[PDB]
From a paper:
To investigate how the GAGs might induce or augment neoantigen formation, we crystallized PF4 in complex with fondaparinux, a homogenous synthetic pentasaccharide heparin that forms complexes with PF4 as assessed by atomic force microscopy and photon correlation spectroscopy. We solved the crystal structure of PF4 in complex with fondaparinux as a model GAG. The PF4/fondaparinux complex is a pseudo-222 tetramer formed by a pseudo two-fold non-crystallographic symmetry and a perpendicular two-fold crystallographic symmetry. Fondaparinux appears as a well-defined molecule, evidenced by the strong and clear electron densities. The PF4 tetramer displays a pseudosymmetry characterized by an ‘open' end and a ‘closed' end that can be defined by the intra-chain distances between amino acids E28 and K50. E28 and K50 are ∼3 Å apart and form stable salt bridge pairs between chain A and chain C. However, the same interchain salt bridge pairs do not form between E28 and K50 in chains B and D, which are ∼8 Å apart. This asymmetry in the PF4 tetramer explains why calculation of its electrostatic potential identifies only two positively charged grooves on the ‘closed' side of PF4 tetramer surface to which fondaparinux can bind. Fondaparinux binds among monomers A, B and C or monomers A, C and D. This interaction stabilizes the AB/CD association and the AC/BD association, thus further stabilizing the PF4 tetramer. One fondaparinux molecule not only binds within the groove on the surface of one PF4 tetramer, it is also shared with a second symmetry-related tetramer through binding to its C-terminal helix.
Author numbering:
A (entry chain B), B (entry chain B): 107 to 170
C (entry chain A), D (entry chain A): 8 to 69
């Protein structure tokens, strides 16, 4: 009934452009964790789990 | 980067078992609208768009 | 009263809404909650009043 | 002050959390928002305090 939201991660986007980050735990409908980021223009993208980039994105959004 | 969350709809579930319903507009990452329902036990399922069932689920959750 | 929607809002541009989640009342929230997510990822609590969320759900279903 | 997280909470079972969304501050919300979604679909606003959301994000990443 449900699959993963993200097909492939991305590496390049400006942390300034990010308004929202959702962290989704692995579940019955997706074997891997997911990192969905929403941008000012409505564009949604996926981040890499094995990178410190998500750590940078998160640390910024909270600092705002 | 993103696909649809729901693969196939469902027809049978008890409206009593439903705690949350999310209505997702069609977008660049999914050609069709989506109706995701969350249940007390954590189970998530998709509803049918061409049915009055979603109308029943929604009308109940608000009445609660 | 430990709800997501303490104060609630009536003014929003329906075209800016990408999703609407209806969360049911419970021991922790006296009322149902209408959470709308906008294009920019932000969220706001919709007034449970009638014609507001009526038109929205249909515009999400087009 | 028309935020999702007016009042905020500190007591939640991390195993009950299925997702955590960080919404950034803006002209409409003075602070960033930590919205946690539980197994039963409900949502609660997490305290922006340190060790609460630190352990959670990692438990979501296992
Ligand atoms: C191209 O060069 C540019 O370089 C950088 C990068 O640009 S980027 O950010 O676009 O990538 C620019 O730096 C940014 O400059 C500002 C900007 O983004 O415009 C500024 O952003 C902050 O302030 C924005 C202006 O808002 S306002 O307060 O001055 O009015 C704000 O964007 C506005 O958000 C409001 C809002 O959310 O309330 C919007 O208001 C409108 O919608 C509201 C909500 O609608 S709803 O549907 O019901 O929900 C309505 O209630 C309201 O009536 C309505 N107002 S109206 O005017 O339409 O009538 C409005 O449309 C938006 O423009 C930013 O909000 S945010 O959501 O994007 O975060 C806000 N960001 S903040 O800094 O975090 O507070 C910053 O200086 C900077 O943005 S950034 O976030 O730091 O990246 C640079 O300005 C620009 N150079 S330029 O070429 O000279 O322009
Ligand atoms: C098998 O036969 C059954 O038939 C029907 C159908 O069952 S079904 O609903 O499971 O499908 C049963 O009818 C239901 O009966 C009640 C029930 O579901 O148990 C009742 O539901 C309402 O009340 C529940 C009991 O709560 S309590 O207030 O009395 O304490 C409630 O479930 C509890 O929710 C709380 C909660 O959300 O706060 C939970 O508390 C615990 O977690 C909290 C939050 O954690 S968090 O992670 O931090 O977020 C903690 O804060 C708290 O400390 C902790 N308490 S503790 O006990 O663990 O220490 C608790 O775990 C839950 O059990 C229902 O909440 S809900 O979220 O499911 O909606 C609530 N539903 S409500 O009616 O909408 O308010 C109803 O009568 C009915 O449920 S229903 O929603 O109408 O469908 C029937 O009882 C049963 N017959 S039986 O065989 O005899 O049992």
């Amino acid at each position: 009934d449900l699959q993963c939201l993200c097909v492939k991660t991305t590496s390049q986007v400006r942390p300034r452009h990010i308004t929202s980050l959702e962290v989704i735990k692995a579940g019955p409908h997706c074997p891997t964790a997911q990192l969905i980021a929403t941008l000012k223009n409505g564009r949604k993208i996926c981040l890499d789990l094995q990178a410190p980039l998500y750590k940078k994105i998160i640390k910024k959004l909270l600092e705002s």
